[PDB]
């Protein structure tokens, strides 16, 4: 799910950037260190809103490092997954263990046990697929997945998906 | 390391609860009485009021009106005169009506009492091992 979250960061600036345009460098650091990053506490951070209106407090010089620590408050759109949520995505990889669905910046794993009994794994077909008398699942196919669990690390997030329940599967 | 670099601001000393030790127990950082007994009752764990007091005082005189006793939570068991013998706590009782009764306050008894106080060998006992051996 996508949220507009008010986040704060502690940036460090090397002494080589102490000039009239120091604020510009801090904005670049925020755009290069925040955007595209994954944080378990808040989830993926996609975009930073109000680029011009970023508030920067006075920097503090570290004793033995010489760099300045800047606390930057900004508004950014984030994607934090949750178990029990229903999301849509496209299958990107397949194997005996299970196929993976691309939900935004996250990859959902559908284990062989979680998928219905009817689905069977066949690798003779190129590419490999999960086939059921009704439908067939393969790369680039759109699948509706239910997140059954999420493990959020400080710098990474992984989740598992299930299509056992009704109204979940090929779209 | 990806964890933020911070400076230690406070050091909160304390004690390890039994649950924490088991839970905590698994560049690497490595992986892992006498005073109180005289203040609380050795049968109910309630504060006597404390060393001088040798009775639980199940009933105490009312503060508002004299000669009008008020019932308080207690068990009326006379407290022992706890003394430290070696590394064990031996309690001596003074019989009302002539050597005092002496017995060793087992750590299990004290552990039970301390747990009633109102944030921060196996082979022998398993089979045989008369009380003297234990």
């Amino acid at each position: 799910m996508f949220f507009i979250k008010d986040l704060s960061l502690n940036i460090t600036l090397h002494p080589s950037f102490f000039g009239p345009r120091m604020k510009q460098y801090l904005k670049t650091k925020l755009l290069e260190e925040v955007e595209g990053s994954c944080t378990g506490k808040f989830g993926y951070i996609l975009c930073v809103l109000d680029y011009d209106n970023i508030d920067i407090q006075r920097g503090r010089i570290l004793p033995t490092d010489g760099s300045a620590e800047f606390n930057v408050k900004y508004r950014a759109v984030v994607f934090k997954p949750f178990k029990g949520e229903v999301v849509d995505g496209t299958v990107v990889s397949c194997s005996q263990h299970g196929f993976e669905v691309q939900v935004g910046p996250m990859k959902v794993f559908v284990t062989k046990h979680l998928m219905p009994q009817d689905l069977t794994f066949n690798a003779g077909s190129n590419p490999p697929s999960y086939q059921s008398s009704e439908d067939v699942i393969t790369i680039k196919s759109r699948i509706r997945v239910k997140i059954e669990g999420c493990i959020s690390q400080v710098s990474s997030i992984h989740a598992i998906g299930s299509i056992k329940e009704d109204y979940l599967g090929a779209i | 390391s990806s964890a933020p670099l911070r400076t230690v601001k406070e050091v909160q000393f304390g004690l390890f609860s039994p649950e924490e030790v088991r839970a905590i127990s698994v560049e690497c950082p490595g992986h892992f009485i006498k005073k109180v007994c005289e203040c609380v009752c050795m049968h109910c764990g309630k504060l006597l009021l404390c060393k001088t007091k040798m009775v639980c005082e199940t009933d105490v005189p009312s503060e508002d009106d004299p000669t009008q006793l008020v019932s308080r939570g207690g068990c009326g068991n006379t407290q022992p005169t706890i003394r430290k013998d070696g590394l064990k706590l031996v309690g001596s009782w003074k019989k009302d009506r002539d050597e005092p009764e002496l017995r060793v306050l087992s750590t299990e008894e004290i552990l039970n009492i301390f747990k009633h106080i109102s944030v921060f060998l196996e082979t022998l006992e398993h089979n045989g091992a008369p009380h003297h051996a234990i």
Binding site: - | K94, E108, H126, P130
Partner: protein
């Protein structure tokens, strides 16, 4: 004597004969047939040595099916000696049985619930198990098999996928074999049982021997305010 005593004894007899070995039946039945029983008298009745009686008593004391009572005895012929008596405290034993029955049933219920959940992959070389959520972050670039973080070896799917039905049978078997305990407990709860004591238990004594050295009498010291843990009952 009373209906309450008979039902409580039957529950104790059933538990011992089913959930314990053979010698335990002998020991507990001897102290149920009799009142508080001295250690020496118990040995003579069962004709078993101290080394064999000790393990039985210790295990029965751990489950609180038998209580111990030590007191000093003063015989004119010999010097003062300490005698040990064994009896049964029905409130303690019944509470222990109720707790254990609930725990055993709950453990099977939890195992059945756990078994129905998806299995967690395990590494053969280091024998360090991994859950599905934990194994998902071990995927490799080619995304064929989970590779152990330590060994860097393909993970092997764990067993217990076929036991989904065996545990249900086990729970069914236990509840059928354990039915008498539940039925007896229901009647016990309906009534109210008094807590026994060494003195109280002596009111139903059937002496084992003719000249037993143990003086089966309770002579508490005069005005002794000392109290031992678990020495009195409501």
């Amino acid at each position: 004597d009373r209906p309450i005593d008979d039902i409580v004894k039957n529950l104790l007899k059933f538990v011992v004969r089913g959930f314990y070995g053979g010698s335990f039946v002998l020991v507990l039945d001897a102290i149920l047939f009799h009142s508080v029983l001295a250690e020496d008298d118990l040995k003579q009745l069962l004709s078993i040595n101290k080394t064999e009686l000790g393990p039985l008593i210790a295990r029965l004391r751990s489950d609180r099916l038998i209580s111990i009572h030590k007191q000093r005895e003063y015989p004119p012929n010999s010097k003062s000696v300490e005698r040990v008596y064994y009896y049964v405290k029905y409130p303690h034993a019944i509470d222990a049985i109720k707790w254990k029955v609930h725990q055993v049933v709950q453990r099977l219920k939890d195992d059945l619930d756990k078994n129905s959940e998806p299995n967690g992959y395990m590494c053969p070389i280091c024998l360090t198990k991994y859950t599905q959520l934990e194994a998902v972050q071990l995927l490799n670039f080619d995304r064929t098999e989970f590779l152990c973080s330590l060994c860097d070896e393909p993970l092997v799917e764990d067993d217990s996928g076929k036991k989904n039905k065996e545990k249900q049978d086990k729970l069914n078997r236990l509840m059928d074999q354990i039915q008498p305990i539940i039925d007896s407990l229901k009647k016990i709860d309906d009534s109210r049982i008094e807590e026994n004591t060494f003195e109280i238990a002596l009111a139903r004594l059937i002496p084992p021997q003719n000249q037993s050295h143990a003086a089966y009498t309770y002579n508490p010291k005069k005005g002794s305010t000392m109290f031992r843990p678990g020495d009195s009952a409501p």
